Swiss-Prot record, chains A, B:
UniProt KW keywords: DNA damage, DNA repair, DNA replication, Ligase, Magnesium, Manganese, Metal-binding, NAD, Zinc
GO MF entry, a single one: metal ion binding
Keyword Magnesium: yes
Biological role: DNA ligase that catalyzes the formation of phosphodiester linkages between 5'-phosphoryl and 3'-hydroxyl groups in double-stranded DNA using NAD as a coenzyme and as the energy source for the reaction. It is essential for DNA replication and repair of damaged DNA.
Gene assigned in the entry: ligA
Identification of the protein by name: DNA ligase
Organism: Staphylococcus aureus
GO biological process: DNA repair; DNA replication
């Protein structure tokens, strides 16, 4: 009955293996080992329920409680970005920045074709996950989001923050899912985004759990507790805090670097294990972002290039 | 929506006031202030449920989850004590200790006429409370025990330990309860112990919460993480760890001291706000207890004197 040693061991191992599988994408042990340890913890929690915890690896299998889908206001409204469609657009963007605050470093990142989500952490624990909604108000899908291994149940520091991310289904998992749908003459999902939408906006988290979803975190509502002085530093810091970020981001020195990054990802996007619908470009320096401010709708320091 | 500051403030205040009321028995603020803050936190948790936590002051109100009453084995079986009925009995106990290990210090304590319970802490959180049962196997009444303010939801150090206590209803609260029963067509409880048993065997934790219960903690299953060298030092340490212990305990030098402690409490027992059915006497020193060991039934190092 005092099983503390084994429970804490199992927590440590399953947490390490999940991170290796789902974040690093670099496994140390085969599935058979993960599954064995997971079934053991599950058995322990069934027979000794006093060992259940909010951040237990068993949270990932989903369970009884259903997503409320209640309307909930974000702590901080999510941004709405202006779009760019060609080099001309990006050069205008660049010139307006260079005329106001001078020559700036940019960060470039892939625009994941996913479902935007806000993930609120209180005392470092994942306590609420909302769809973006209208940007001010979203739907509570917390119980479903909890089953995504790429979302940490506890971060490395006990912060009170709302992180923003893109939830998605990997391309191949989508294709395999569709193969199963056809096998069972069900209607196939249109694309990975629709499949991930369907998977998140349903009532049984155990069904979400069986679907293959991940996330990339791209920002946070409040930088107060961050050492970061730039967007790129913020993403590195999110990495250190335990979050899953996109490794294909790049700092560039000028608009020629931004154009180069877009040209690269025009050709390379095909090979990615997820769909992207564009490239987001941001003035890197956080203070300089503040200097540029917002229009009535959108940051003046960011633009979303859209692939045709 | 980021209500972290007010929530932590409310936890801090309500935890302080609860302890002052129910543990120190020395309030600093009137009920009106406690109730006002509690009602505020409840409203916050209703409208912002992401702020609910396992150790929230709101736990004390009770909830929807019911005690399972499942049969559960204790981590460590609870002791069964031999009895003494007079001075001769206590002298024989004393003589057999001093013939085998020499002259020892004793701890004397009041034997609370309550319901014996084991309270299991994992990582310092109260996770399971069982009735004593047969000493090996008890009934799970965790949800009900959670509503007793004198049981800490979180201890001051993250230990994995099973503490042992006596749960009871104060005499005056028993009397007032009985007065209420004599308003409806309702049968009165026989005595405080019976009232407390009835209160803890409810299916509705919200009813248990409305009853006035308390606890005294008297021991632990495992002293491994305790710096205590004696029973009295262990009780002091439980105090510092955040538990509710009985302050009427005394260290005495010999059997003459034990007899005087019993004579004192024969007279003073009537003035106590709870019922006692005896006095427990223990070899104080933990190593010496280990030295005396056990018969097939009972520690050789302890005895329960029983009032007639």
């Amino acid at each position: 009955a005092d099983l503390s040693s084994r429970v804490n061991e199992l927590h440590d191992l399953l947490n390490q293996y999940s991170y290796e599988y789902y974040v690093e994408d670099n496994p140390s042990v085969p599935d058979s080992e993960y599954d064995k340890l997971l079934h053991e913890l599950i058995k322990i929690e069934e027979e000794h329920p006093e060992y259940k915890t909010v951040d237990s690896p068993t949270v990932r299998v989903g369970g009884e409680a259903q997503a409320s889908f209640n309307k909930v206001n974000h702590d901080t409204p999510m941004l709405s970005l202006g779009n760019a469609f060609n080099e001309d657009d990006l050069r205008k963007f660049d010139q307006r920045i260079r005329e106001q605050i001078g020559n700036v470093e940019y960060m470039c990142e892939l625009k994941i074709d996913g479902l935007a989500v806000s993930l609120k952490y209180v005392d470092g624990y994942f306590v609420q996950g909302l769809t973006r909604g209208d940007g001010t108000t979203g739907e509570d899908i917390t119980e479903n989001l909890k089953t995504i291994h790429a979302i940490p149940l506890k971060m490395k520091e006990p912060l009170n923050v709302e992180v923003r991310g893109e939830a998605y289904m990997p391309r191949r998992s989508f294709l395999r899912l569709n193969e199963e749908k056809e096998k069972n003459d069900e209607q196939l999902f249109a694309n990975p985004r629709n499949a991930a939408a369907g998977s998140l906006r349903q009532l049984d988290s155990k069904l979400t759990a069986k679907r293959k979803l991940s996330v990339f975190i791209y920002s946070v509502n409040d930088f107060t507790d961050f050492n970061a002085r730039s967007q790129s530093e913020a993403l590195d810091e999110l990495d250190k805090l335990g979050f899953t970020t996109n490794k294909n981001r790049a700092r560039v020195n000028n608009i020629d670097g931004v154009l180069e990054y877009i040209e690269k990802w025009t050709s390379q996007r095909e090979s990615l294990p997820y769909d992207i619908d564009g490239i987001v470009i941001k003035v890197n320096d956080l203070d300089q972002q503040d200097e540029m401010g917002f229009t009535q709708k959108s940051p003046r320091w960011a633009i979303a290039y859209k692939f045709p």
